[PDB]
Amino acid sequence: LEEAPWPPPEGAFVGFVLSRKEPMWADLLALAAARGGRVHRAPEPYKALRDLKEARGLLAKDLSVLALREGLGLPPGDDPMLLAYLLDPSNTTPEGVARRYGGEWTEEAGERAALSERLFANLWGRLEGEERLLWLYREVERPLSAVLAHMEATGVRLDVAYLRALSLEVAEEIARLEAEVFRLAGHPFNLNSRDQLERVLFDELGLPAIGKTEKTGKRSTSAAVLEALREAHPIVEKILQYRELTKLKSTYIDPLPDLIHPRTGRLHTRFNQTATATGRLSSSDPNLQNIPVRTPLGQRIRRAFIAEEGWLLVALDYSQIELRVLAHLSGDENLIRVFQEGRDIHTETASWMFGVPREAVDPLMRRAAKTINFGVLYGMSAHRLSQELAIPYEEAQAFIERYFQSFPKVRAWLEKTLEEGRRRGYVETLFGRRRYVPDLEARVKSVREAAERMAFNMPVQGTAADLMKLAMVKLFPRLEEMGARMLLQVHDELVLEAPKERAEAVARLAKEVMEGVYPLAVPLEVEVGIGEDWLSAKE
DNA sequence: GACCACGGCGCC
DNA sequence: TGGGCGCCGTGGTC
Ligand SMILES: [Mg+2]
């Protein structure tokens, strides 16, 4: 490991240290590069950043993000993490990827660059004759790492003053519920403490314990348990309400405003690219993929997300991408005609299980077909089906068998995936992204059947992901050539920011690029809204 | 202060 | 016996 003075040969492997994991908040403590068997250690890291053509190494996207806040372009290129992730998506961290493919992840820039070259070598050849996963790395993941670096650096604009006024409203509503419940308890206790609540609910008050917690076996105070004791006591509704408010206060309203960045006046997530078993992205520090939208107070928080002045937000949402993906994968003639005909899946699905004349008089069957249609994706069981309808474990089974008479190639796809899973030891997406699921042949049924749900969701969830990522790759350069921005992805939706004048012209472009990303035996449909805020934009 | 397991819950 | 995530407070350890 011979030490050459800094200016490194072109195309070298970078190795960097940050004071903290978040590139947008980090100081560049150290910089290195490696090519052949030579270590080029930068004396002045931020200065040294100017000399690179592209970032190439573990966490390439991170360095490209920090470079971007500093004004420097610098895209990300090869990343052994991206390759390892495609071999086996349980490869999430460089600690692990190193300590599996022949290195040690250290807290030193040069050894991080020495690790990069070494890890990349040992992995790119480990991808010999994986045409499919090489296509995924070239035409999806490497390019996307750039797109994500641009998104992460842009950030999304937030109305702080608005959030701070909320905090004061919600604070006060919390205070009333708090003092209600205590009066009902006949004493005050910490309502954030589920231990203390447990005692209050089940010992002190006389209430029935419905279920128990997994690891420790305490009486559960979850929503599903409290929603089931709604009738039994007026303290329960209050507790439910107090959880709603404190969850949203503690998770979103209170902390988000403090994470505005001095240089931008914007919020910056991290989009982790090698963090999940299916090939979805996750979002982090903070997570903007779980900003609320169901509840009223929830919907008020979402208004806080706004466009720069003079711009608008464009929100684009795929419409049942996962069902459509299933239809494509299963090849169920019946099911794909429901999307080709431009019909309302759950309407038609109800009108096929029961087989009601045409489409007529189905208010409680709409719920019934909707529920099954996502419950085939997660492996929803009869009991669970029986619990969500008010109907018993018996009629619910027949719903399941009926649905498979409606859709016989779904079942055959299901079973085929399971068997090839056991055979090859993994399952895979339409683009050949794989997830190894070795418990498919476990001797304990609970764990086997748990494995099976994991196993047959992955091809659909990962294909929806694959489809979204490829769209992001395709769409982005069209947005840049239009001075539009790409702000967030939320699994099957995209939030873009565009200038008021061109906003409709961006919407149209974005929508069409997404409906046409990779055409299937069904069509992809996309809803689009425009607005000053995320809520308004009509997600 | 930094971190941990847990139960809980927001989103797709 | 519902897939995939990340973050909250509590209660507790160094
Ligand atoms: Mg949506």
Residue A1 near residue A45 (C-beta atoms within 8 A): no
Residue A307 near residue A497 (C-beta atoms within 8 A): yes
Spatial separation of the C-alpha atoms in residues A100 and A94, rounded to whole Å: 9
Q: How many CA atoms lie less than 13 Å away from A55 in the CB half-sphere? A: 28
| A133 CA to B6 C1' distance (Å) | 38
Query: Rounded to the nearest 5 degrees, what angle is found at the Cα of A537, between the Cα atoms of A536 and A539?
Result: 105
Spatial separation of the C-alpha atoms in residues A353 and A4, rounded to whole Å: 72
Copy the structure tokens of residue A155. 């950030």
DSSP A7-39: SPPTTPEEEEEESSS-GGG--EEEEEEESSSEE
For residue A248, which of A187, A163, A143, A325 has the smallest C-alpha distance? A163
**To the nearest 10°, the Cα dihedral for A340, A343, A346, A351?**
-100
Side chain identity at A303, as an amino acid letter?
R
Residue A254 near residue A167 (C-beta atoms within 8 A): yes
Nearest nt (C1') to A246 (CA)? Answer: C8
For residue A459, which of A420, A485, A493 has the smallest C-alpha distance? A420
**Main-chain dihedrals φ then ψ at residue A358, nearest 5 degrees:** 60, -135
Rg of chain A over Cα atoms, rounded to whole angstroms, equals: 26
For residue A471, which of A81, A86, A147 has the smallest C-alpha distance? A147
Residue A496 near residue A484 (C-beta atoms within 8 A): yes
Residue A16 near residue A41 (C-beta atoms within 8 A): no
Helices marked H in A78-230 — which ranges?
80-87, 94-101, 109-124, 131-136, 142-154, 160-185, 194-198, 223-228
Residue A252 near residue A292 (C-beta atoms within 8 A): yes
Residue A331 near residue A521 (C-beta atoms within 8 A): yes
Residue A104 near residue A115 (C-beta atoms within 8 A): yes
Give me the residue label for tokens 């004493």: A187
Spatial separation of the C-alpha atoms in residues A459 and A53, rounded to whole Å: 37
Q: CA dist A111 to A15, A172, A503, Å?
A: 7, 54, 47
Nearest nt (C1') to A322 (CA)? Answer: B12
**Bridging pattern class, strands A305-306 and A156-158:** antiparallel
Q: CA dist A450 to A173, A418, A440, Å?
A: 41, 12, 9
The number of angstroms, rounded, from the C-alpha of A396 to the middle of its chain's C-alpha atoms is 31
DSSP label of A42: -
Give me the residue label for tokens 């990522």: A469
Calculate how far, in angstroms, residue A535's C-alpha sits from the geometric centre of ligand 1: 11
Residue nearest to nucleotide C3 (CA to C1'): A378
Copy the structure tokens of residue A227. 């929603």
Spatial separation of the C-alpha atoms in residues A399 and A248, rounded to whole Å: 37
Spatial separation of the C-alpha atoms in residues A513 and A166, rounded to whole Å: 38
Instruction: Using a CB cutoff of 5 Å, list residues around ligand 1, an ion.
Output: A 317, 493
Q: Go through the domains of chain A in sequence order and give each one's CATH number.
A: 1-153 (3.30.420.10), 154-270 (1.20.1060.10), 271-320+465-538 (3.30.70.370), 321-464 (no CATH)
| A217 CA to B4 C1' distance (Å) | 19
Give resolution in angstroms.
2.5
Helices marked H in A342-444 — which ranges?
345-353, 363-375, 382-388, 395-406, 408-424
DSSP A187-225: S---TT-HHHHHIIIIIIS-PPP--B-TTT-PBP--HHH
Copy the structure tokens of residue A183. 């009066």
Q: How many CA atoms lie less than 13 Å away from A180 in the CB half-sphere? A: 15
Widest Cα–Cα separation across chain A: 80
**Main-chain dihedrals φ then ψ at residue A225, nearest 5 degrees:** -80, -40
Adjacent-strand bridge partners of A55: A76
| A186 CA to C4 C1' distance (Å) | 42
Residue A87 near residue A123 (C-beta atoms within 8 A): yes
Residue A532 near residue A310 (C-beta atoms within 8 A): no
Adjacent-strand bridge partners of A267: A156
**Main-chain dihedrals φ then ψ at residue A476, nearest 5 degrees:** -50, -60
| A246 CA to C13 C1' distance (Å) | 27
Copy the structure tokens of residue A171. 């604070």
Calculate how far, in angstroms, residue A493's C-alpha sits from the geometric centre of ligand 1: 6
Q: CA dist A204 to A229, A232, A236, A240, A348, Å?
A: 16, 15, 14, 19, 50
Residue A495 near residue A537 (C-beta atoms within 8 A): yes
Is residue A246 packed enough to be buried (19+ CB in 10 Å), middle (13-18) or exposed (0-12)? middle
Spatial separation of the C-alpha atoms in residues A115 and A16, rounded to whole Å: 11
Calculate how far, in angstroms, residue A180's C-alpha sits from the geometric centre of ligand 1: 36
Spatial separation of the C-alpha atoms in residues A316 and A301, rounded to whole Å: 19
| A441 CA to C7 C1' distance (Å) | 34
For residue A213, which of A232, A234, A197, A189 has the smallest C-alpha distance? A197
In which order are the strands placed within the sheet that holds A305-306? A266-267, A156-158, A305-306
Query: Rounded to the nearest 5 degrees, what angle is found at the Cα of A354, between the Cα atoms of A349 and A355?
Result: 80
Side chain identity at A135, as an amino acid letter?
W
Calculate how far, in angstroms, residue A183's C-alpha sits from the geometric centre of ligand 1: 40
| A168 CA to C1 C1' distance (Å) | 43
Q: How many CB atoms lie within 10 A of CB A83?
A: 26
DSSP A462-504: HHHHHHHHHHHHHHHHHHHTTT-EEEEE-SSEEEEEEETTTHH
Adjacent-strand bridge partners of A313: A497, A531
Contact positions of strand B to protein Cβ (< 7 A): 5-12
Q: How many CA atoms lie less than 13 Å away from A441 in the CB half-sphere? A: 10
Which structural technique was applied? X-ray
